[PDB]
Amino acid sequence: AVPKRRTSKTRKNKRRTHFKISVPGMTECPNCGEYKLSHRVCKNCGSY
Amino acid sequence: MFAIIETGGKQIKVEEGQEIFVEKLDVNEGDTFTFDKVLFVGGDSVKVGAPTVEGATVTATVNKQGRGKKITVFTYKRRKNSKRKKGHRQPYTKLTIDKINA
Amino acid sequence: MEAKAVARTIRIAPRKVRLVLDLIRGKNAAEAIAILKLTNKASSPVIEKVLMSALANAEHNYDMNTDELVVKEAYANEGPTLKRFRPRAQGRASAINKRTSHITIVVSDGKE
Amino acid sequence: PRVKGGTVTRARRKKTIKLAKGYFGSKHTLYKVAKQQVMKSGQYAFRDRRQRKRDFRKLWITRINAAARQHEMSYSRLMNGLKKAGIDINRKMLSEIAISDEKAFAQLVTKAKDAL
Amino acid sequence: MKLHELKPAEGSRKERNRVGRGVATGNGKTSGRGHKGQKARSGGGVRPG
Amino acid sequence: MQTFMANESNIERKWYVIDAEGQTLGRLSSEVASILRGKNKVTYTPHVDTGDYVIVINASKIEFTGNKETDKVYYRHSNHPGGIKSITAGELRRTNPERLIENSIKGMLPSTRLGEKQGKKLFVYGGAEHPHAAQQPENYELRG
RNA sequence: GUCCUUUGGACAAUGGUAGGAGAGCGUUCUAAGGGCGUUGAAGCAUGAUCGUAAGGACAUGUGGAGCGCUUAGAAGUGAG
RNA sequence: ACCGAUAGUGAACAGUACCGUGAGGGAAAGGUGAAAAGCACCCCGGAAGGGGAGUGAAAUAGAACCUGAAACCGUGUGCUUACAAGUAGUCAGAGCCCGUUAAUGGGUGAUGGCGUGCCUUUUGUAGAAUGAACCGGCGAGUUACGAUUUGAUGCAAGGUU
């Protein structure tokens, strides 16, 4: 119910290994455009 | 080609033209020290000195009388309030071999 | 040649800004601007304004190009913290920290 | 007059923190834990300066014993034979010769052997 | 005698003992008193006689 | 003076063949463990791996003394409640005798990571036939 | 320490809690004498230096006006 | 031979903010520069903030303004790490990277040996007995008057106000 010892820098930064943001897609927009959220309805600088 | 000499309280394997470090000798820098106690001669003809080789001198030239790397001696006892701290540097003499005799 | 920009006292917790700065680091500028428009995070617009300010410095202050530019450095530093309190149940209080950050990027040329 | 507890405290604490350099995590950064590790390691070094002597003697004896079984003899019997021949050479010396010049070591083995 | 170089007679002044100032002095932690009881206490001891 | 060979680094490992027919398990085991360990080389240092490869091929003419066959149970636990298993010496020698020999070699080696590596220089075969002719293996005879 | 005392050749000795005895290291302030400092004081940071210990220097960077040493004296004189 | 901003008055800017029905209790908080010359102007921006340029001996002296330690949080990089069992050090020791108060040089470290923190209290504590989250400051044999016993110094059948 309470932590028995404190958490160290090594252990806390190991736990944060997967606490990441996913890279958004990076596909070329097909009709016209540039790299984007893949297979999107992409309108940002494009016409998907 | 190599010889065994007994100097200080220790024994050292030596060859013509190498540098050695021994316990302090009474000599000054520049001088030539000569070792008596030779135990083994590893040449083309091998001489074994079970006591001594009876002859067998090794010549060397003194250079750099010096005092060694410093170590801190520290000891303590746990729940007793006693600890001791002191420093030590050990003296040495530096030599280069020129002669191995027999 | 390098150019930079800084944003000081951005009232967002640095641990949250750093999570979006890891997507644009070491990328070239157009790539980075495009990435900062598709990720939905509260700090994306602020970071994107600092990147435009840095890009603008590199072509007015040092009068060089803008397509041959790469994000050399991006980091967040801590600012000063504001101290607050919530009231909790048994008539007793607890602390709230309102953390801030300092934002820097540097856009580089790859050369002198 | 009044003294302040000024610049002396940091100097004394900073010596210990520098002397804890290379330790793991808090061990090389925080004074109370660094002080404990730096006094613990000083007591290790005393014990281990004593232990080097016996560790190298153990290694020399085992290498001479390896060299002795090659010439069909045991370490204990060899050293006894050398004592009876009077040979004054040393465990460390006996290993260094047995590694560099096997032909000098073989003559020692024969004299140690017919001394018996 | 000059006023910048002056010394007392040999053996005429000593320094005072200062207890409670670490362990190498010999009378740190308990400061000469031992461990417990009435004579380890501040203002303690007993009346003469 | 430090005049002392230690740096075994860049050693030369060889390849050996011992046969198990009509030997005692423990005595063969201890001599082989010594060879794998490197205790027989005038150049020996405990922190680097000297020592060399040993091939045991008959592993079926192993000899026990006394009533070892029915006694000498082997045990293992699976960390699952009540999960103790067992097998007696004779039927372990009768099915998978290679395990019988290599277990008792590896129990005679240090349990460090270097020691568990030195146990990987061991190859055991039931029957007098092995595949290692490209290594050019030499016969070694138990010098008890 | 010991004693022939050539204080060196030896005869030695040298684990330690309550606790007794001795000798020292640093801090702030005062007197006297000599010093240093915008061509850069104190403080801060780094170094592979010195002393038997507490501790002392010097070089470099930062800092921008004060501060050492020698002999003596007096204490709000040392923290895990 | 008093203190120098946790000191010295509670109070260097207050019997105030605040707390209490009331009697009453009671803080934290000094420092740009010699002189405001306290940043005209352009660029990004809604702004804040920044980049140049300028003033200055000096703007990492820009008002959160003398210096600016540590805990704590980051960015980069030389060596090392995904078969491994641990008070994390010490002694030995390859391989790789360096070059100093140049000296029996520095950084990191495959692999081997040995090794149950500190303080307090106890016959006896790794203890599953106490205490400490970490770092910084502050925090405990003193003075006055008497008495006894040592050391020093002057005079001595006297010595001292």
Automatic annotation (TrEMBL), chain B:
Residues 80-91 have a biased composition (Basic residues). This is Large ribosomal subunit protein bL21. GO terms for molecular function: rRNA binding; structural constituent of ribosome. InterPro entries: bL21-like, bL21-like_sf, Ribosomal_bL21. This protein binds to 23S rRNA in the presence of protein L20. Coiled coil: none annotated. The keyword Transport does not apply. It holds the Pfam family Ribosomal_L21p. Residues 80-102 are annotated as: Disordered. It comes from the Bacteria. The lineage of its organism: Bacteria, Bacillati, Bacillota, Bacilli, Bacillales. One of its GO terms (biological process) is translation. Belongs to the bacterial ribosomal protein bL21 family. Transmembrane segments: none annotated. Part of the 50S ribosomal subunit. Contacts protein L20. GO terms for cellular component: cytoplasm; ribonucleoprotein complex; ribosome. Keywords: Ribonucleoprotein, Ribosomal protein, RNA-binding, rRNA-binding.
Automatic annotation (TrEMBL), chain D:
Transmembrane segments: none annotated. It comes from the Bacteria. This is Large ribosomal subunit protein bL20. GO terms for cellular component: ribonucleoprotein complex; ribosome. Binds directly to 23S ribosomal RNA and is necessary for the in vitro assembly process of the 50S ribosomal subunit. It is not involved in the protein synthesizing functions of that subunit. InterPro entries: Ribosomal_bL20 (IPR005813), RIBOSOMAL_L20_CS (IPR049946), Ribosomal_protein_bL20_C (IPR035566). Keywords: Ribonucleoprotein, Ribosomal protein, RNA-binding, rRNA-binding. GO terms for biological process: ribosomal large subunit assembly; translation. One of its GO terms (molecular function) is structural constituent of ribosome. Belongs to the bacterial ribosomal protein bL20 family. HAMAP family: Ribosomal_bL20.
TrEMBL record, chain E:
Residues 1-49 are annotated as: Disordered. Residues 42-49 have a biased composition (Gly residues). It comes from the Bacteria. Residues 1-18 have a biased composition (Basic and acidic residues). Binds to the 23S rRNA. Belongs to the universal ribosomal protein uL15 family. Part of the 50S ribosomal subunit. This is Large ribosomal subunit protein uL15. It comes from Staphylococcus schweitzeri. The gene is rplO. The chain holds residues 1 to 49 of 146 of the full protein.
From TrEMBL, chain F:
CDD domains: Ribosomal_L13. It comes from Staphylococcus schweitzeri. This is Large ribosomal subunit protein uL13. GO terms for cellular component: cytosolic large ribosomal subunit. This protein is one of the early assembly proteins of the 50S ribosomal subunit, although it is not seen to bind rRNA by itself. It is important during the early stages of 50S assembly. It comes from the Bacteria. Pfam families: Ribosomal_L13 (PF00572). GO terms for molecular function: mRNA binding; structural constituent of ribosome. Keywords: Ribonucleoprotein, Ribosomal protein. InterPro entries: Ribosomal_uL13, Ribosomal_uL13_bac-type, Ribosomal_uL13_CS, Ribosomal_uL13_sf. PROSITE patterns: RIBOSOMAL_L13. Part of the 50S ribosomal subunit. GO terms for biological process: negative regulation of translation; translation. Belongs to the universal ribosomal protein uL13 family.
